[PDB]
Amino acid sequence: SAPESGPVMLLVATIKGAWFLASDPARRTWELRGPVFLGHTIHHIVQDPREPERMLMAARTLGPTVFRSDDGGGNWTEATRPPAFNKAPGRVVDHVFWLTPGHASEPGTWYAGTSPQGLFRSTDHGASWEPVAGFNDHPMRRAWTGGEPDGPKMHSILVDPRDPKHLYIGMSSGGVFESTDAGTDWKPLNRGCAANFLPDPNVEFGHDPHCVVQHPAAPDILYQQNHCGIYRMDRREGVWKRIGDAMPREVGDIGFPIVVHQRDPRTVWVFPMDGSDVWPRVSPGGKPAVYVTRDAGESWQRQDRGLPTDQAWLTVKRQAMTADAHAPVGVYFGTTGGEIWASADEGEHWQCIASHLPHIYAVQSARP
């Protein structure tokens, strides 16, 4: 990986529309465009890295759908067939929560994760979606998911860069699950991860991962921010290890998002929150900070330069942190209070580049 260069774009999904932030090549001044779809609840906006001119946006009302653009966001068209569960001999899609573009060798293929938990696939750039039957009708599904916050959801859909058949998914609640046959079969992969909200924490599934990532440079390495900690797994070992235990006692290792440095599998960023109350309640602290590790979780450093020093009760949701692929890597986050904070030096300094936006669900980097 050669570092990317030039302008960065941030795709910002909020409860009342989509906004877009564009930088100069130096990433010092930013331009805000939007709202796009003002009054609609936008859950996720993702650029196809295979074809940068293509973008998908998970949105509600039309009911729940996916809008597509083939001109880098200049025009949006609703799905001809959005994600919908099959007729029961039944469950209903509340919203499309997460969008993942497929493997390099399968252009036009995407996965979608819904609330309640459901996995869907498009092979036509998100125009039409069908259920991934191997998950949605798996005999263990109801046991893995359970029943009905905003509702339970499917997230962290990961397609292995080395193999389109190797997939990972995250479910709140349920856990991390793996397929080695493009989703025709799934198995739980939660070993080593706590589930302290369950009667027996040492079960196979039922866990509450918040955000899972597979490193693009070292795809055996997975990181997750869970309701019960920050974990790292080397897939060859098959166990999640709580690297979050290196966090300071007063800060803890609870939070929602997790982000990895594009080139360095040892560098990861989290946004800690107070998880000391009963499940699923996570509360903000008054002293906001991102924490970085540059040694795969052995040590953590606080990153708060430029951020409000105190009486600042910031919530950062799962999809609301992202990072670019520039040198140095820039890091960004969006708060439920409507601020977009940006760093162009791996989280060492922060600058508020947007404020007074509606409640932010997701922030995603993109190449204009």
Instruction: Give min distance, CB of 324 to Cl ion, in A.
Output: 26
* 359 binds Cl ion per the rule CB under 5 A: yes
- Residue whose token pair is 């706590």: 194
Residue 134 has φ and ψ, to the nearest 5°, of -60, -20
For Cl ion, the closer of residues 120 and 269 by Cβ is: 120
Residue 316, classed as helix, strand or coil, is: coil
For Cl ion, the closer of residues 215 and 361 by Cβ is: 361
For Cl ion, the closer of residues 73 and 131 by Cβ is: 131
* 60 binds Cl ion per the rule CB under 5 A: no
Q: Which of 358, 360, 363, 365 binds Cl ion (CB under 5 A)?
A: 358
Q: Which stretch binds Cl ion (CB under 5 A): 23-31, 79-87, 96-104, 119-127?
A: 79-87
CA pair distance 336, 259, nearest whole angstrom: 18
Count, residues near Cl ion per rule CB under 5 A: 12
* 104 binds Cl ion per the rule CB under 5 A: no
Q: Which stretch binds Cl ion (CB under 5 A): 69-77, 103-111, 190-198, 308-316?
A: 190-198
Q: Which of 131, 170, 183, 284 binds Cl ion (CB under 5 A)?
A: 131
Residue 13, classed as helix, strand or coil, is: strand
* 136 binds Cl ion per the rule CB under 5 A: yes
Taking alpha carbons only, the member of 282, 258, 280, 261 closest to residue 270 is: 258
CA pair distance 331, 27, nearest whole angstrom: 11
Residue 277 has φ and ψ, to the nearest 5°, of -85, 180
Instruction: Give min distance, CB of 74 to Cl ion, in A.
Output: 26
* 279 binds Cl ion per the rule CB under 5 A: no
* C-beta of residue 111 within 8 angstroms of C-beta of residue 125: no
* 330 binds Cl ion per the rule CB under 5 A: no
Q: Which of 75, 77, 86, 202 binds Cl ion (CB under 5 A)?
A: 86
* 196 binds Cl ion per the rule CB under 5 A: yes
Taking alpha carbons only, the member of 84, 98, 101 closest to residue 170 is: 98
Q: Which of 55, 84, 247, 314 binds Cl ion (CB under 5 A)?
A: 84
Instruction: Give min distance, CB of 173 to Cl ion, in A.
Output: 14
Residues 6+ apart with CB under 8 A from 174: 117, 144, 145, 146, 152, 205, 206, 207
Taking alpha carbons only, the member of 320, 319, 286 closest to residue 304 is: 286
Q: Which stretch binds Cl ion (CB under 5 A): 41-49, 92-100, 166-174, 295-303?
A: 92-100
CA pair distance 7, 223, nearest whole angstrom: 28
Restricted to residues 15-54, the positions that interact with Cl ion (CB under 5 A) are: none
For Cl ion, the closer of residues 275 and 347 by Cβ is: 275
* 93 binds Cl ion per the rule CB under 5 A: yes
For Cl ion, the closer of residues 85 and 313 by Cβ is: 85
Instruction: Give min distance, CB of 30 to Cl ion, in A.
Output: 21
DSSP letter, residue 321:
E
Q: Which stretch binds Cl ion (CB under 5 A): 29-37, 132-140, 213-221, 310-318?
A: 132-140
Paired tokens of 114: 């819904």
Q: What angle do CA 307, 309, 310 make, to 5 degrees?
A: 130
Q: What string marks each residue from 219 to 248 as x (binds Cl ion by CB under 5 A) or -? A: ---------x--------------------
- The DSSP line for 253-306 is S-EEEEEE-SS-TT-EEEEE-B--SSTT--B--SS--EEEESSTTS--EEE-BT
CA pair distance 329, 348, nearest whole angstrom: 11
Q: Which stretch binds Cl ion (CB under 5 A): 52-60, 67-75, 134-142, 167-175?
A: 134-142
Strands of the 175-179 sheet, one edge to the other: 153-159, 167-172, 175-179, 187-188
Q: Which stretch binds Cl ion (CB under 5 A): 84-92, 216-224, 266-274, 295-303?
A: 84-92
For Cl ion, the closer of residues 2 and 278 by Cβ is: 278
Residue ranges in contact with Cl ion by CB under 5 A: 84-86, 92-93, 131, 136, 194, 196, 228, 358-359
